[PDB]
Design a protein around this nucleic acid. Sequence first.
RNA 1: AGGGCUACACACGUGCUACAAUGGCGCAUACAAAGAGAAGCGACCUCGCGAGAGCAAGCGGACCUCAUAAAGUGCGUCGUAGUCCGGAUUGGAGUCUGCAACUCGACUCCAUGAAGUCGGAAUCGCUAGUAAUCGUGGAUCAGAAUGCCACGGUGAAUACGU
RNA 2: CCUCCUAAAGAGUAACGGAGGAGCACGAAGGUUGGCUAAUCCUGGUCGGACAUCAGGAGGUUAGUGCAAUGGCAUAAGCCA
Lengths: 178, 79, 114
Amino acid sequence: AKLHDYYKDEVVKKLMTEFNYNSVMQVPRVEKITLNMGVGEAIADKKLLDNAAADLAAISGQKPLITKARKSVAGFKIRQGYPIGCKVTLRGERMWEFFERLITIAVPRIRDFRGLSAKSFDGRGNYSMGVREQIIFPEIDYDKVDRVRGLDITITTTAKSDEEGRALLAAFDFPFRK
Amino acid sequence: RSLKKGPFIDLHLLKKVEKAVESGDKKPLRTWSRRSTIFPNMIGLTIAVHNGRQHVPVFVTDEMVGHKLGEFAPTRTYR
Amino acid sequence: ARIAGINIPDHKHAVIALTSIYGVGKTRSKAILAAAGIAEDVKISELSEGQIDTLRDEVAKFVVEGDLRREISMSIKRLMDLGCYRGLRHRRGLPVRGQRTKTNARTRKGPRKP
RNA sequence: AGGGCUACACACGUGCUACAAUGGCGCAUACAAAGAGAAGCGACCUCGCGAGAGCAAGCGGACCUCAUAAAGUGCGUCGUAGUCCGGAUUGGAGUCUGCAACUCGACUCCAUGAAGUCGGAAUCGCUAGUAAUCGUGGAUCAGAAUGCCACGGUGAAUACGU
RNA sequence: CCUCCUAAAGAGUAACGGAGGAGCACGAAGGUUGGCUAAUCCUGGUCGGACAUCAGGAGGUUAGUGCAAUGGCAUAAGCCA
Ligand SMILES: [Mg+2]
Ligand SMILES: [Mg+2]
Ligand SMILES: [Mg+2]
Ligand SMILES: [Mg+2]
Ligand SMILES: [Mg+2]
């Protein structure tokens, strides 16, 4: 709950005066990170998926959830089954703990990072940005790793507006860019 | 661009371009001194460079300075 | 060791190995050694800890790997997006060093396109 | 005056440099010929990573300069690798020649480091100081030689026979 | 042999009338228990673009149904174990 505590403590009140919320039971909270890493391709290789799995299971403290195919009529092709990735949401503790390894050891463990997006927001107020490339962070033998990677990450906060979505995250150590 | 020390240009464009500096931007600048380097004074000015055929509407730009007014006007026609 | 990133030359002499670092040649590599305090015959791999530590630390000066291959393409664009003969050449797969196109240019354009 | 003769999707002839270990790279270091030069050759020393710049001697030349030949020899490294092979390409920054280096000069520095692993059918030259290989000078010329003309080092193989 | 119209709001009814299918398929695609719910679009997201997977919103049987058509299906007759 490292960052978790920081929320209720530093954060919250910070928003309670910057947003003048009536009840503490309103201040936008952190509603699980989602992750994904759509392996796509698969089809032929298929192994790049199981690899992406562990490569994912490494990041997330839980177990990868290999997805299937909804349409099964993909322009490319793809059938009903045809695995394409593994979301793997985050769970409170591990979630915030991940919010730690990230923002402090993820975005920080840059590649050429010089500012994070500020439009990764949504309507109800939910930010979700793709790393564009797994920063090779604490993975099985950083160097002795699988060919590239790259994946996505969604926060999905309990905010009612992206505007308020800015306070949250920014209330923490979200690198961003201003 | 090797010219050791001394950005060379033709006197013509100079006396003419300088007038533009004060009189302000306006009509182009019928010039053949395509071998002259661009200066920040003519920055974003209305110039004209020959190329065997006729002249072309050349306009100076920020970084577009240390170059010659000619390396912006292609000569040979290719398909 | 990563040294500057990925690139992990081993066995080969420190000099000839360091060159593997995307962005340095016999010159930059041969100097970085002495400047850091490393011999030439010394095998980067056999080297002791510090004998590899200083390397990274000192090579941090000159630009390498990504940044290089990165900005290097930016300079190519600066003129392309500009519209000068130079850039114009690239967007046409033709030599800029002012070579002959009617003949010999396979390295620029590529193999025959009959 | 500017541009074009340096255009490029192609094909053909003539060449240069490679594919490496009979080699590359480092250091040390031996032997040559023939030529050029007052609007030239230009040392010495100074600065510069270098091209080159400053100052300025000598020589119209068996006096001076261009000019400290390369292969080679010694030692060491490399370890058969697309590899310390090979260098095209390109990017950044510069020197110099001339009013003038965009189009279109030569070169220097750092970086980049492709094709290429000895090449089909077919085809070329060469019978000895020749071939092969390695360097050197000159003409033209402000400044653009892998071309041309010329010089010497090292130095083969094979020829029954028509 | 099956489905719809003709068929006049019960059944049923003709034509060389208008349309389309069957001659099978599943030891699970059956039984049961437990659980789940689409299509489509909008916004935001590595490689993801018209559309692969992820997130949120709108939407509401427009999805799905082993194979025609009609009827039916959310207490699902749809989906998973
Ligand atoms: Mg000609
Ligand atoms: Mg001469
Ligand atoms: Mg000459
Ligand atoms: Mg009836
Ligand atoms: Mg009736």
